[PDB]
């Protein structure tokens, strides 16, 4: 998933209002990446 | 009667005589019974 | 636990209780279950002297399923988990090679059960 | 796991197995094996992070058990398994010669005991060489201990994000509230 | 794993190392534990009828 396309979209005013609000996107992306790599870890560990 | 603070002891102190030509073998036995507990289910709501 | 410790005998250590597992019984509890385990425990040990192998008639003999022990004057063979003396014969031992290689072998005699009745 | 504490006999002869690289070393105050010391070394004026995170509402408590007691437990288990085999795991411990126990284990895996009895020196040499090789290998390779490092890094990252969150305006005038 | 592969001998394949299990030794580490496994491996095969 992407932050801006779901939260603000293509509105620069929304973007530069939001950038001051917080830093949630880093945590969201980190969790998603962890799950993504865990999938391949599982497949490797079961079949190899 | 009072409250005392201390350092615990890990357990008893034991040593075993080890030799290159020695062995030990039991001669009597005993029967024992033990119990264990495990939960299974939990309550449903709405 | 239900699958393995109740419907059969388990060899895994400490899985179905402490000691040597024998059987089990389940009981019903509110939102849970109760197990009873039956185990076997040895006791009352005793000191002894042992040797690895016996050389007799220039040949080395090993125990087939037991272990060699000595009371101080004689030699016997017994199972590992209980004490019972028996006479060392050729029906519970087997031969492999001469006795010039194994370290710690002792000198003794082996009772052959064939000879006494063959002489009778 | 165990109820008693066992000690090795002062004499250190076991038919040809050195075992020196794993037993505790009396010289070092930590009474740890060389492998343990290598692992501890390998795994790693101003204010410390402890007080820094302290003074914002976060505290770190100490554990209950200590490294000396943990090492004592490990040494007791090692001595018990060296001296008595598996007997002490289900009752009173009974002594038995080490080659005798090895013969029992070889019978268990399924090879007759004469094979062991006629290759003792070769087996001991291979065992000592393998111990030396594993010592060299874990001394050399620096990328075999990832998991604990990852755990520590995750915890530190979470705490850092939490503390850094305090300076956001959240849409108000200023983050500082006394102003 | 500590309960099964140390205080006794296990028969489950690839549970206490690669190959035929014989014995194992435990070691302590910061916030973790380390096990050393000893196994048996055959070699030098031959053909027969």
3-state secondary structure D86-152: CHHHHCCCCCCCHHHHHHHHHHHHCCCHHHHHCCHHHHHHHHHHHHHHHHHHHHHCCCCCHHHHHHH
- Chain C residues within 8 A of E3 when measuring between CB atoms: 13-14
Burial of D2 per CB tally in 10 Å (0-12, 13-18, 19+): middle
The span from the CA of D82 to the CA of D63, in Å, is 30
Q: Which residues does residue E32 pair with via DSSP β-bridges, in sequence order?
A: E29
Q: How many residues does chain A have?
A: 48
DSSP bridge partners of D141: none
Distance of CA B1 to the CA centre of its chain: 30
**CB-CB neighbours of D34 under 10 Å:** 15
Which residues are B31's β-sheet partners?
C40
Q: What residues does B36 pair with on adjacent strands? A: C35
Chain C residue numbers with beta carbons less than 8 Å from the beta carbon of D94 are: 45
| Residue C65: closest CA among C85, C47, C82, C80 | C80
Q: Which residue of D has its CA nearest to B22?
A: D96
Residue in chain C lying closest to B41 (CA): C31
- Tell me whether residues D171 and A21 touch, CB distance under 8 A: yes
Q: Which residues of chain A does D168 touch, with a Cβ-Cβ cutoff of 8 Å?
A: 20-23
Cα–Cα distance, D39 to D135 (Å, whole number): 11
Say whether residue D118 is in contact with chain C using an 8 A CB cutoff: yes
Interface touch E30/D148, C-beta < 8 Å: yes
Q: Is B11 on the interface with D (CB under 8 A)?
A: yes
Report how far residue D114's alpha carbon sits from residue D112's, in angstroms, rounded to the nearest whole number: 6
Please tell me the distance from the alpha carbon of residue D105 to that of residue D83, in angstroms, as a whole number.
15
CB C61: neighbour CB atoms within 10 A?
A: 22
Cα D158 → chain centroid: 27
Nearest CA in chain B to C51: B21
Axis crossing angle, helix D120-140 with helix D34-42, rounded to the nearest 10: 20
| Gaps after residue numbers in chain A (C–N over 2.5 angstroms) | none
Torsions phi, psi for B24 (to 5 deg): -135, 150
Q: Does E4 touch chain C (CB under 8 A)?
A: yes
Q: What tokens were used for D135?
A: 């010592």
Is residue C4 classed as helix, strand or coil in its secondary structure?
helix
Experimental method: cryo-EM
* Touching pair C, E by Cβ (3+ pairs < 8 Å): yes
Of D92, D100, D117, the CB nearest to C102: D117
């Amino acid at each position: 998933v992407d932050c801006t396309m779901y939260i603000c979209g293509d509105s620069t005013e929304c973007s530069n209002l939001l950038l001051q609000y917080g830093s949630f996107c880093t945590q969201l992306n980190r969790a998603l990446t962890g799950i993504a790599v865990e999938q391949d870890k599982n497949t490797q560990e079961v079949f190899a | 009667q009072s409250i005392i603070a201390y350092t615990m002891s890990l357990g008893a102190e034991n040593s075993v005589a080890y030799s290159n030509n020695s062995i030990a073998i039991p001669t009597n036995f005993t029967i024992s019974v033990t119990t264990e507990i495990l939960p299974v289910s939990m309550t449903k709501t709405s | 636990k239900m699958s393995e410790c109740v419907l059969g005998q388990s060899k895994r250590v400490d899985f179905c209780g402490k000691g040597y597992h024998l059987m089990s019984f389940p009981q019903s509890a509110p939102h849970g279950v109760v197990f009873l385990h039956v185990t076997y425990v040895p006791a009352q040990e005793k000191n002894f002297t042992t040797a690895p192998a016996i050389c007799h008639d220039g040949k080395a003999h090993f125990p087939r399923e037991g272990v060699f022990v000595s009371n101080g004057t004689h030699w016997f063979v017994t199972q590992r988990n209980f004490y019972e003396p028996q006479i060392i014969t050729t029906d519970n031992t087997f031969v492999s090679g001469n006795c010039d290689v194994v370290i710690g072998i002792v000198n003794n005699t082996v009772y052959d059960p064939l000879q006494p009745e063959l002489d009778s | 796991q165990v109820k008693q504490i066992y000690k090795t006999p002062p004499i250190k002869d076991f038919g040809g197995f050195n075992f020196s690289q794993i037993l505790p070393d009396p010289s070092k105050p930590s009474k740890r094996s060389p492998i343990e010391d290598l692992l501890f070394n390998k795994v790693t004026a101003a204010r410390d992070l402890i007080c820094a995170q302290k003074f914002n509402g976060l505290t770190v408590l100490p554990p209950l058990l200590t490294d000396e007691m943990i090492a004592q437990y490990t040494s007791a288990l090692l001595a018990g398994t060296i001296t008595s085999g598996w007997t002490f795991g289900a009752g009173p411990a009974l002594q038995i010669p080490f080659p005798m126990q090895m013969a029992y284990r070889f019978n268990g895996i399924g090879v007759t005991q004469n094979v062991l009895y006629e290759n003792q020196k070769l087996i001991a040499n291979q065992f000592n060489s393998a111990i030396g090789k594993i010592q060299d290998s874990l001394s050399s390779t620096p990328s075999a201990l990832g998991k604990l490092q990852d755990v520590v890094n995750q915890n530190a990252q979470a705490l850092n994000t939490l503390v850094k969150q305090l300076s956001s305006n959240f849409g108000a005038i200023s983050s500082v509230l006394n102003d």
